[PDB]
Design a binder for this molecule. Structure first.
Ligand SMILES: O=C(OCCO)c1ccc(C(=O)OCCO)cc1
Ligand SMILES: O=C(O)c1ccc(C(=O)OCCO)cc1
Length: 497
């Protein structure tokens, strides 16, 4: 049962059971404590002997999800400082050249961990894929921009994790030259950001973007504002030099206030006009710092970033219903609010009619959920695909359309429902997908992911602008569809960003 493998920092002891070797909490960066909250990830202090790698490490400091989300997305926090660790599932460390899937968890850059139960890599390892998950720094620590700290520590962490994979995964049976990085939303946005980041060069051959594209970045000037507000509220200077000393509970508290305020209508007196005007989607998304991330990933990708990387991308049909529906308040959303929302994008009120006409929302709240799904996820995803029309690498699209039965079906195919299907961890996701989700669909989706990691082809026609074909996953039927939601898609043709 014990299995000892050499990492670049020393031997680690995992566990091998029923054909799968599992290593949990392999350090890939020194604990980011104090000042090192904000420094670039440091290689773990080498050790002699054998470091235990049987238990997941500490996870990154995160605030609890808002109660609405947190009842559906139940996070597993692991206390401690040594959280820049990764986990490896391999069917056999001695294997030759296994596909490697590196999971970058989502969680809006403030939440998540690589070690969440639903992200268990065993189903991947069972299918002949080396699976790697890891924690990267989150929130203020990961991404608040500071003049005296490298920007985007969380992104640096992901790079360091992928470099660990590059440098170590052959010892776990993986082909470092067949790495598929994949992630959900913030994790997929991270992947897009990595595509756009010179420092991530060559660290992955393929990418699966589950509900995240290249739009999720903080303008440097906004990140500066955000750090200034954070620091002001903490009563310290907006510097790593100051923030290194703030108890993490206080950090997370102010981080949460920033998150909530940016998620709402930011007070211009506190946030300035840009941020009040919505210039920030996620306040701890990667900063367009200029050195690590030179431009928004979507623009980098439009210019060819990641065009050598095979791409599987998709969205959940009703993604944003997760953020509007679970508390039963969608019916209160008004047409005029939706109209005002559409107007923020320069769309007329009757754009809502197109949503209704395509079955994407009867009531304004439903339409709003679909609009936001489009604005933040589906259209950005499609823009990346469109950008890749001439990419040498392949592009495949999916739509995850299976609707969770939770809360009387009000969530539809909402955000995160696809995750246990990808991972075949449906029994760990019942808070979101209910008690009896179709394991067949988990098999279908997961196997497609494995096939894509293995060969760069998930097993269905490639995406192109001609037919815009995506695999629409659902149960009982997952089938190809072409040019889905063409009328709502066209609404966005000329929308800024
Ligand atoms: O609300 C979101 O869009 C931001 C626009 O304001 C949002 C963004 C990212 C995630 C995520 O990373 O989820 C990963 C799965 O746990 C979830 C939600
Ligand atoms: O989709 C997800 O990411 C996700 C969904 C649900 C859960 C969870 O705690 O379920 C517990 C019931 O088995 C965790 C993660």
């Amino acid at each position: 049962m014990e299995i000892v493998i050499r990492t670049g920092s020393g031997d680690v002891r995992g566990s091998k059971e029923n054909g799968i070797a599992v290593f949990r909490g392999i350090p890939y960066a020194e604990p980011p404590v104090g000042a090192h909250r904000f420094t670039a990830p440091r290689p773990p202090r080498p050790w002699d002997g054998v470091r235990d790698a049987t238990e997941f490490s500490a996870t990154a400091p995160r605030p609890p999800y808002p109660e609405a989300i947190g009842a559906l997305l139940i996070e597993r926090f692991i206390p401690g400082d040594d959280y820049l660790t990764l986990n490896v599932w391999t069917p056999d460390p001695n294997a030759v050249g296994l596909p490697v899937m590196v999971w970058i968890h989502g969680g809006a850059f403030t939440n998540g961990s690589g070690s969440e139960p639903v992200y268990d890599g065993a189903a991947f390892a069972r299918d002949g894929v080396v699976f790697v998950s890891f924690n990267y720094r989150l929130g203020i620590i990961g991404f608040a921009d500071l003049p005296d700290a490298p920007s985007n520590r969380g992104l640096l962490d992901q790079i360091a994790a992928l470099e660990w994979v590059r440098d170590n995964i052959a010892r776990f049976g993986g082909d470092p030259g067949n790495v598929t990085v994949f992630g959900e939303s913030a994790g997929a946005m991270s992947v897009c950001t990595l595509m756009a980041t010179p420092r991530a060069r060559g660290l992955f051959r393929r990418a699966i973007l589950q509900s995240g594209a290249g739009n999720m970045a903080v303008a440097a000037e906004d990140a500066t504002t955000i750090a200034a507000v954070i620091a002001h509220r903490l009563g310290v200077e907006p510097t790593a030099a100051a923030l290194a000393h703030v108890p993490v509970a206080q950090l997370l508290d102010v981080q949460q206030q920033v998150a909530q305020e940016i998620q709402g209508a930011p007070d211009p007196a506190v946030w300035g006009e840009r941020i009040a005007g919505g210039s920030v989607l996620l306040p701890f998304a990667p900063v367009i710092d200029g050195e690590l991330l030179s431009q928004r990933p979507a623009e980098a990708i439009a210019g060819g970033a990641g065009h050598d990387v095979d791409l599987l991308f998709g969205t959940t049909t009703d993604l944003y219903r997760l953020f509007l529906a679970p508390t039963g308040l969608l019916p209160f959303i008004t047409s005029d609010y939706v109209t005002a929302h559409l107007a923020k994008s320069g769309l007329d009120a009757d754009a809502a009619k197109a949503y209704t006409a395509e079955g994407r929302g009867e009531e304004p709240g439903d339409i709003l959920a679909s609009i936001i799904t489009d604005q933040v996820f589906r259209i950005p995803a499609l823009r990346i695909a469109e950008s890749r029309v001439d990419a040498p690498a392949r592009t495949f699209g999916y739509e995850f359309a299976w609707r969770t039965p939770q809360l009387d079906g009000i969530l539809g195919a909402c955000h995160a429902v696809e995750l246990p299907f990808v991972f075949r961890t449906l029994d760990r996701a019942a808070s979101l997908v209910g008690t009896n989700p179709p394991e067949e669909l988990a098999e279908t989706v997961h196997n497609a992911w494995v096939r894509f990691a293995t060969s760069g082809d998930p097993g269905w026609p490639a995406w192109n602008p001609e037919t815009r074909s995506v695999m629409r996953f659902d149960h009982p039927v997952s089938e190809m569809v072409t040019d889905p939601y063409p009328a709502t898609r066209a609404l966005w043709d000329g929308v800024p960003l």
